[PDB]
Amino acid sequence: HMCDAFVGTWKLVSSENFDDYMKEVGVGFATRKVAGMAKPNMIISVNGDVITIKSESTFKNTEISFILGQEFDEVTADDRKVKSTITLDGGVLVHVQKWDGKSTTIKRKREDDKLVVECVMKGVTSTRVYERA
Ligand SMILES: CCCCCC[C@@H]1C(=O)Nc2ccc(Br)cc2[C@H]1C(=O)O
Ligand SMILES: [Br-]
């Protein structure tokens, strides 16, 4: 019942500073432009201890499945090969990606009727707001 309030189908409704976040992570120009235009649907489900998060857009369809606290391999939408760990911290899903000596954190939280995604790399934050589809 750990993630019940996250489960469902969510659609992107607003983005701020995402291009700059992608620049900080190292995403190249053409990927940034195409990715920045996307309006993904995020589909979150839980089966037992396994959480699955899908992102589906004209840019890319991605999928991760994981157990909280248990590291896994992820290929990101921009094709980084990262080691990821997702935990729950005070009701916030905290997703840390490590690659090439670098780190970025993506936080997902329920706030009112929204699911708010905060992507942070060094001093650059991007906020992406999703609502139920
Ligand atoms: C090239 C983009 C790399 C960073 C993606 C970060 C976030 C994510 O975790 N998944 C995802 C996948 C595709 C696109 Br476009 C945007 C997102 C973001 C979000 O949920 O809105
Ligand atoms: Br996307």
Curated annotation (Swiss-Prot):
The keyword Iron-sulfur does not apply. InterPro entries: Calycin (IPR012674), Fatty_acid-bd (IPR000463), ILBP (IPR031259), Lipocln_cytosolic_FA-bd_dom (IPR000566). It is found in: Cytoplasm; Nucleus. Keywords: Acetylation, Cytoplasm, Lipid-binding, Nucleus, Phosphoprotein, Transport. The lineage of its organism: Eukaryota, Metazoa, Chordata, Craniata, Vertebrata. CDD domains: FABP4 (cd19467). Monomer. Homodimer. Interacts with PPARG. It comes from Homo sapiens. Forms a beta-barrel structure that accommodates hydrophobic ligands in its interior. Lipid transport protein in adipocytes. Binds both long chain fatty acids and retinoic acid. Delivers long-chain fatty acids and retinoic acid to their cognate receptors in the nucleus. GO terms for molecular function: fatty acid binding; hormone receptor binding; long-chain fatty acid binding; long-chain fatty acid transmembrane transporter activity. A fatty acid binds at R128, V129, Y130. Pfam families: Lipocalin. GO terms for cellular component: cytoplasm; cytosol; extracellular exosome; lipid droplet; nucleus. The modification N-acetylcysteine is found at C3. Coiled coil: none annotated. Gene3D superfamilies: 2.40.128.20. A motif (Nuclear localization signal) lies at residues 23-33. GO terms for biological process: brown fat cell differentiation; cellular response to lithium ion; cellular response to tumor necrosis factor; cholesterol homeostasis; fatty acid transport; long-chain fatty acid transport; negative regulation of DNA-templated transcription; positive regulation of cold-induced thermogenesis. Belongs to the calycin superfamily. Fatty-acid binding protein (FABP) family. This is Fatty acid-binding protein, adipocyte. The modification Phosphoserine is found at S14. Changing E24D: In a breast cancer sample; somatic mutation. It comes from the Eukaryota.
